[PDB]
């Protein structure tokens, strides 16, 4: 299993990212968002707009998980080390999920500052990764 390079980033980073943005099939209109965010990030942060979002992702990624792991013939909530795969899709998946729920009036505005927010280790998507070590931790 692989994706395919975004064509402006050349970025599978970035196609991972506009599936989880996509809705109804509106990809062109899943992809104006992402590139358009991308150029918001680039205006207000002056940076690569690739540098902003793997600094989010850097920070939103989970290591530890706790998850059902049936032992004995129980049921236990239990603390493990999240994947490679698994820590991206998370990430991408809290920076998309929290991003919708934001109250900026656009959904390019809305990702843009999720990512410049979660860039900077705040944000929904920085505390959902948070929450996520914490219950990883006492479990």
Same mark, same amino acid.
């Given at each position: 299993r692989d994706v395919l390079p975004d064509p +402006?980033?050349?970025?599978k980073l970035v196609t991972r990212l506009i599936n989880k943005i996509? +809705?109804?099939?509106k990809k062109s209109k899943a992809q104006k968002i992402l590139y358009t965010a991308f150029d918001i990030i680039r205006e207000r942060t002056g940076k690569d707009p690739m540098e902003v979002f793997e600094q989010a992702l850097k920070n939103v990624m989970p290591v530890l998980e706790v998850r059902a792991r049936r032992v004995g013939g129980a049921n236990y909530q239990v603390p493990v080390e999240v994947r490679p795969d698994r820590r991206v899709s998370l990430g991408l998946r809290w920076l998309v999920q929290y991003a919708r729920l934001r109250?900026?009036?656009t959904m390019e505005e809305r990702l843009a500052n999720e990512i410049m927010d979660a860039a900077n280790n705040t944000g929904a998507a920085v505390k959902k990764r948070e929450d996520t070590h914490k219950m990883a931790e006492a479990n």
């Open positions: +402006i980033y050349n970025s996509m +809705i109804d099939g109250n900026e009036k």
